[PDB]
């Protein structure tokens, strides 16, 4: 895109101003030198899908008068703070899942001489949040509105995540938890409001769009592409081709509560139901070839598409109707990227 | 004191308020049913020294015709807050340390089924500070700063955790990291700015009181105090009666940057420095002894009780000096019970 440049340049301003101004405070350099390392190692990397969103919609959403470029840059600010309760919620998924890479790279918390430390590092990825929104916003009317969004989009992904916990445990293999509106619910909570909500939001309220109806708008419509997101998330990572998606998936041995899953639970018969009691969450490759096996004799990629046929319509459908007073290239330039 | 009895009882509504108030969103009953169990696991059990003062400062400060029963709630609630900062910290702290109990109970990341889990739980409680804040001060005019006061007592208990955890690295031994500086630097963000700034402050933000001097001035007596409690800690962890101190006293086998083994790194022939760098750390009793015995011979405990009465001194004169406008007592009640 046309601004994908400007976005990654200005993470280096964004780590100038979170170390370089606590510089009048030396006894606290040697902290503020590993705040930095975290930063780096995991802050970048990613698409940016997220930070970037949050520019694209303050560009499409603020009246071109009122876009200076301390304007921009607030809004740079802003997509970097998405990134950064990214980065600070992956790091701490990845030390509870006993993840060994993220980006095909080391978990940070694998990383010599880090390991649970990364629990604080974690933390202060987090609080970088808002130390930025006081440096760039504080004197903006949207500034509480940001730091109330903030922290609302932490607190859902965290219940979001308790969801997950309690749904999948690691060694209690129990199928029985695996329903769709459990499904749906930590979609919704863990994946949905943080990816899809937050990045829109935000820019919302810059562009003083603050109105409860508003925002009810367009969470309507960014949670159910949110669903769709996360849904076509988990038919990838078996029957995507990992070349184009640069992922080799992994949820079956990982005892996911994947769509895939929770489908096939609904359209086993009990031997099925049993099969899948054998071969859900083994390493062992023919274990997963028998799962997928199963998943494929119950033609789960054509309910794929034919979901994913429906949820386009219905998302056209919800932007018609609720995406007014915003343009709708807002919500459709996020639908032609993730269909 | 008067007040103990209605904050830990107002425990049970900051509960009802943080689980009941979702009840209209069934799907995450079973995460928030969790939610309890980690809020009763945590939050329960210490002192309360820190949301007690809070309450304390509270009724000191705001005149008495605005100390309704509504006011009253929300100081009782903004305790709780400083209450959850602790336990988010603590909880966290105990799995990056791998400790075994906390107030002799077993930790919470310790018990069956919860593991690294605690890693999202402690997140949790701190989420739920920013909730109760919400649902208690966001129509009161001191809401945003107590938001900012949270953040950036976060912050800087983390920041503090950084330069212990880069100072103190178990299994890189090595004292030459332990400097008065660097101990003093640890105690002051690590401990100081949340259980003896945070609590007086946000009773003064409660108060109207939110001016940068009025809070410069507190801040210089509370830190000073803080410095005194902590060193006060490191002595008592090895000295004092455990019977008296409810504690039994490690910091010697955890490899602590304690006052004490900076105060003795500071006095120690080459001889000595030898005979620490050999038993420092060791779970083994006799090395322990023989630190305690080394300790001894350089006259530490004389040196901490000097330390004792010039610190009272300075505290009463910062106290003289920088009280006003708030009443003195504000800063005596909490030097009479550290002191
Ligand atoms: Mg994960
Ligand atoms: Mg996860
Ligand atoms: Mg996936
Ligand atoms: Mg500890
Ligand atoms: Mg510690
Ligand atoms: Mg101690």
New interface residues.
Partial sequence: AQEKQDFVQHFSQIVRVLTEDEMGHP??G???A??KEVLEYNAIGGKYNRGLTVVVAFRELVEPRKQDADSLQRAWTVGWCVELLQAFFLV?DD??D?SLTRRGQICWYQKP?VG??A??????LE?CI??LL?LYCREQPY??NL??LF?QS??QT??????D??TA?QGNVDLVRFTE??Y??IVK?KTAFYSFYLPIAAAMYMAGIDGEKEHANAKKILLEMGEFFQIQDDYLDLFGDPSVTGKIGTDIQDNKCSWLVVQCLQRATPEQYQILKENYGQKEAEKVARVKALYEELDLPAVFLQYEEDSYSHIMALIEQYAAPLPPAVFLGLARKIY
């Fill in positions: 006894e606290i040697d902290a503020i590993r705040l701490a030390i509870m006993s001489g649970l430390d629990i604080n590092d974690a933390n202060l609080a808002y130390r006081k500034y509480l730091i109330e922290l932490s607190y965290e219940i979001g995540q308790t969801l916990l309690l445990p509106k459990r749906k619910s909570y």
